[model samples]
Target: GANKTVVVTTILESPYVMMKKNHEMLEGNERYEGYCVDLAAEIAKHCGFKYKLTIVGDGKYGARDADTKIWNGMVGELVYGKADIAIAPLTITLVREEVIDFSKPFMSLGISIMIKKGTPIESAEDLSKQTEIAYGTLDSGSTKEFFRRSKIAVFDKMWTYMRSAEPSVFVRTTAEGVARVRKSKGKYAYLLESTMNEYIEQRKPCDTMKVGGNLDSKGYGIATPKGSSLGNAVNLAVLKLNEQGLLDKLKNKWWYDKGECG
Candidate 1:
């Protein structure tokens, strides 16, 4: 087989994909580093292919348009044949599965609540039962979708409030929602992935807390265009890495090894 180059698309999420400290002076792939970048290299190595890592142009993980029935972000890249593989914190969902193939999840995670210290909120149940404190997830993505589609009464109720809440509780990004929690002084809570919530809890200013157990269970997977030749090879690579404990090593390397939470 020809050692063809794979074009891998990913998003810019801290610990997953982030600009290097010297990124201003670096160029192309050398300018960035994170879990996904390292994972891409290993996948390519085991699969006997070269890969070029590229950030998604739209800066979104990927979501489908309700009106146009089009996908955007990394998923869009794969669906439109703009990229050959996707290696990032991309979640494996049924909707995306219909359009692309995914490797077994490389990391397990779930939705969680991020509250500023001293905030009265403790759980989704608490948030659902109150009007005194405002809370929301990123405006798009699986976390938001989970709430919107939930059959669980607590989540269903919360989604109803979020959709119709005055002053618009929805936020455009996790950072925006986290900032809202910080600046609102106990008046706001941010709902995001437990992975992100834990990462933020270990960062400086450490004013935020990941309160309560996760709201649900899910995992992040590497994605490929449907029927791509690379899918099987990449899946094997991920499984091998997991069996050898490389995935846990990588997580600790990025998340806790460099933590500043002290």
Candidate 2:
């Protein structure tokens, strides 16, 4: 029997699915590097499927538009049957859960801060009370949504400023957010997932730092459309990988062994 090659949807965030230096000379999966790239291979092997990786066309993790009532990014791809699976640093969230299925969290993380070193900010509370240093999230997905929905006093205050910030503090990608922190020269800070924050601390020109601790607890999961045939085995594969310590190994390999800071 011939099985169609599974299509995997993901993003181009660093330490996740970055293009290789020589990607221009390569084709297919060989053109990519990073943790998700490795995880994708292991997943296909354990689940016994041929798969192809494709970046989300909209260059987003996924979020539904409030005005148009349409989903965007990888979630949109899965819901529309354009991709069979999503393997990205996509968060596990409530609204998304209603429309899709997620493999048990493969990585634990939380919302955290990325500041230009010596920016005088120590925590979320500190940022909330200040007006001089502007802060924001990776534009429209869970992190931004989290701020908008939070009832907590500090986050509410931060959201108020972020929503009205003159230059618009949001950035399209985590990489762009990091670049903003670097170039803002202590005037701006980026609030994003702790995994990406921790990853950047190990990369070249490490001038930025993750401050204090995670603001909220959460995890990232593999995603599929509701009732997808590939869903069950993929969930089992993630469980097997978690127990076998492959996830930890993959984290070490991508986060430290190939680390640029040291």
Candidate 3:
């Protein structure tokens, strides 16, 4: 298997995995670009292999199906041998780790609130204890799952409200939730990963802002199937990149340096 082509499963999360501006003229990996794209190159270079990047068919980060007992999304691709590894804004969670392996986190983040600028809301506590401005999370991802599994008092209470909220506040994607916030006239708040919240705040139109500190602390890691040989190689590669400051460099390259809000 010398010089084998590695199959990497990723997602289309801005500044992470995105189609290049001129992707239509390019082919295969050349057709896409972003932080994860660059990281994939670095990882493949260090691990001594070529790779083919593929978008997750379901376009999800990964979640377990309770009734069917199947995994779906990028994590599922690895679990089912559809891909060799995952290099995206995939979080490293205890449940996921049990079924697959993760490289050391390349980026650290936590859940945060996204709101239109000048909204009276400033914190989760403020939003939680009131009913004027509606709020919710991505319909079927870790952010939603976090609230579902949380036992902390405030989080627990907030989950209770979100679960039974009228008109069904949950959205299918970050963009949909952000769109709702933009068109809602300050009547909606979207909860998402802080990394994305900050990235979107720097995008064009620049009408949104990330408020309050992160709700919790977590990090995104490169994932591989359980017992995959690529796991250790990718882990070491991530550590080397972190030590050499490449991770920070890639983040700034994609996030702030190209920011349109300035």
- Give one digit per residue, the lDDT tens place, for model 3 in 130-175: 8788899999888999999999888898899899988888998888
What does candidate 2's lDDT look like per residue over 1-262, in tens digits?
A: 6799999999888888999999999999999998999999999999999999999998987888889988999999998889999999999999899999999999999999999999999999999988899999978789999999999999999999999998999998787899999999899999999988999988879899999889999999999999998999999999999999999999999888988888
What lDDT does candidate 1 reach at residue 95? 91
User: Model 2 Cα displacement at 141 (Å)?
Assistant: 1.5
Candidate 3 regions with alpha-carbon error over 4 angstroms: none
C-alpha TM-scores of all predictions = 0.96, 0.97, 0.97
What are the clashing pairs of model 3?
none
Cα RMSD to native, each candidate?
Answer: 1.2, 1.2, 1.0
How big is the positional error of residue 14 in model 3, measured in Å on the Cα after superposition?
Answer: 1.2
Give the Å error, residue 239, model 3. Answer: 0.7
Error of 1 at 36 (Å): 1.1
lDDT of 1 by residue, 215-239 (tens): 9898999999999888998999999
List the candidates ranked by TM-score, beginning with the highest: 3, 2, 1
Write out the backbone clash pairs for model 1: none
TM-score of 2: 0.97
Assess the local accuracy of residue 126 in candidate 3 as a C-alpha lDDT between 0 and 100.
91
